[PDB]
Ligand SMILES: O=[N+]([O-])c1ccc(B(O)O)cc1
């Protein structure tokens with residue numbers, strides 16, 4: 001059976017642990033695994049460009065021995081003059097895996113329903129599961145065992161990072177709190193899936209508007225930009241609601257004394273996170289960015305071996 | 308002494324047979340030929356984007372051991388900052404071959420007359436000769452011998468696939484029929500070149516507006532996108548009714564993308580006669596064979 | 606060890622430049638014999654403004670060192686700080702190659718990156734092209750020390766500045782022939798004058814193109830106008846016509862003189878067909894040598910850093 005990775009809970013707790021261990025092994029020995037030797041191809045397709053996502057995948061695929069064929073948004077968007085199913089059938093003849101950045105989850109589902117190679121969600125509207133693998137690798141590096149840790153996410157609680165932190169976090173046994181204003185709460189289906197997965201791992205899900213309560217006793221504090229490019233014209237003031245949730249020094253001081261801070265780059269210094277927090281000793285954002293390379297390579301190695 | 312591939316008949320019948328044999332060998336052993344090991348470079352230049360063309364060449368060059376340097380939209384189209392002759396001299400210092408998607412054929416001929424490395428027409432307004440190499444590879448693996456098969460192309464008979472199926476088909480000994488409406492017939496000079504080449508191979512060239520007669524007894528049925536501004540092409544749709552008139556075990560080809568419901572139906576596209584998925588994959592193998600062959604003689 | 610950068614031509618001492626140029630000759634002869642980036646290791650190649658010629662040379666050169674070039678096109682400083690970019694890239698790649706505009710941006714990146722930073726091309730310098738030029742001159746003429754080189758045209762552009770600095774580092778007597786108002790930046794000119802003291806070279810700036818051509822071993826020109834200057838308000842044709850590198854000018858130089866021009870050339874403006882395509886032209890070898898000289902520079906910086 002062909003395995004895909006479209007959202008964080010596509011891996012069981014045991015499987016996620018396997019991928020995270022592989023990510024640590026690959027960080028130590030980055031060119032020791034060559035499942036794409038040849039080179040074999042991997043398609044890396046962007047319905048909307050993401051330079052950082054392309055950078056890490058392109059280099060990582062090369063270090064697995066392969067050749068990434070990158071298709072940027074300058075090409076005709078998939079689905080516009082050929083069905084996704086037809087594209088999947090041809091790609092399955094050319095490459096050993098399909099890495100895709102797209103929008104709605106239904107598009108990823110349609111591709112994965114037909115492709116005979118693994119399909120990976122590089123980044124989408126609803127989830128960012130590869131970044132959360134990198135996040136979990138980073139937390140393990142700086143904290144040790146993930147089970148039982150307390151992680152709080154602040155800001156827009158319905159964006160892709162909030163959803164993947166919920167799903168990926170509870171899969172790892174982490175107690176996850178989303179601190180967000182009313183009207184910006186996690187998708188109910190994602191929250192229910194996280195609550196169910198949490199029953200298997202001893203984790204828990206909390207959603208609150210009380211940012212100070214969310215930070216108290218936290219081991220990991222996370223935030224992300226308050227607005228995606230697609231949201232700039234949605235009509236909302238996307239600054240005023242989030243100001244109480246800014247990851248600043250006062251908020252960090254409420255957390256456990258050994259707490260660390262994560263943020264997917266790019267960051268907007270002075271909005272969701274302050275310079276003092278970005279550049280202080282609690283910040284893990286630089287290691288986090290680097291671990292995108294290793295965690296994505298580990299995911300590819302794992303999916304290719306299982307598929 | 309430096310060989311180019313700008314149109315289908317740039318290869319003789321014997322040379323075409325060599326390239327198709329190489330494509331079959333490379334399909335079976337895709338990293339066994341490493342003429343570009345190093346890596347040595349190959350330029351892949353697009354005056355107009357073609358993602359599918361870029362995709363197959365880029366991966367194929369890598370599997371020959373090389374590094375494709377791709378110049379597409381956003382990067383500099385050739386001849387805007389310097390003469391094409393100046394570009395050809397510098398490229399000949401950097402890469403071992405030049406793969407170019409451009410429009411008019413006078414631009415390809417100009418490059419090829421100056422460059423001292425092989426120039427390949429990746430796709431042009433007048434010819435699509437790499438796709439036809441992939442088509443011939445697909446027909447051979449489904450049918451065996453190409454000589455004496457009947458191939459019919461339906462739809463726009465003035466586009467690059469019609470021209471290349473004429474030239475490449477008769478070069479392989481295939482009897483080629485183009486079924487097209489009156490405003491969309493092959494370029495007369497291309498048709499004449501195909502009729503001449505067919506004399507050497509025992510093939511033939513037929514142009515007709517009668518889609519039923521073109522489908523009757525055909526072994527290979529081919530179509531392509533038509534672009535109601537498509538009224539004249541509707542009688543030429545590859546549907547189940549047309550396919551039912553062909554020889555037993557006939558196959559259907561279509562350079563992708565396909566507009567399902569226009570030039571070809573779901574039933575034909577997804578049925579047992581369709582070979583469009585193997586055909587798409589064989590662009591990789593046939594283009595690698597072409598490059599290996601041109602590099603060995605250049 | 607100190608991380609070494611190459612942002613302008615005099616970032617290499619005379620002895621260091623000689624080492625890089627010797628390595629360029631070795632790599633031209635044996636282009637896959639140095640594999641410091643085997644793995645592959647990454648090299649970031651970043652363009653604030655796209656340059657297809659720069660991309661081709663670096664992309665292929667990095668690959669021939671065993672590495673993988675990760676190209677980032679103009680389609681830095683906007684989404685995140687240059688310091689933030691340097692921190693993260695220093696974790697991904699073994700070197701940063703950057704085409705940008707003002708020199709202060711290169712300086713800032715190099716001040717904080719923990720891997721070598723290379724100026725691929727900037728508004729003020731083009732030091733990789735001048736390494737390729739020096740490699741070409743050495744192939745055609747042998748020892749560089751004591752040669753006389755004259756550059757004609759816009760005397761304040763990146764090629765004029767780098768021919769001054771890189772030329773006098775190699776011991777070449779450099780003349781810049783340019784009209785009033787188009788003269789080398791004073792700081793660059795003073796730096797070249799000081800460096801020329803160390804090598805026995807010299808710096809000459811003149812408006813007399815005929816005097817600059819007489820006795821020259823190497824004649825160089827470049828486009829009169831960069832893309833960012835097309836809207837600067839000046840007539841950028843009339844001042845430069847007396848400085849065209851044509852057959853009459855070349856005839857004034859030494860009988861064995863060679864001609865250089867960083868491509869692309871606008872035939873009929875700064876250079877003529879007869880010169881460009883005649884036996885004195887070295888422009889094609891010069892373009893090829895971008896590949897070899899940049900590979901040599903990368904090998905050298907990586908080993909020193
Ligand atoms: O995932 N990457 O490749 C990547 C690259 C660069 C950055 B950075 O400059 O912000 C971040 C991430």
Ligand SMILES: O=[N+]([O-])c1ccc(B(O)O)cc1
Nearest residue numbers: 087090359362363563587590
């Ligand atoms: O030649 N290729 O690489 C290629 C790639 C993709 C397609 B397709 O999705 O239709 C077709 C051809």
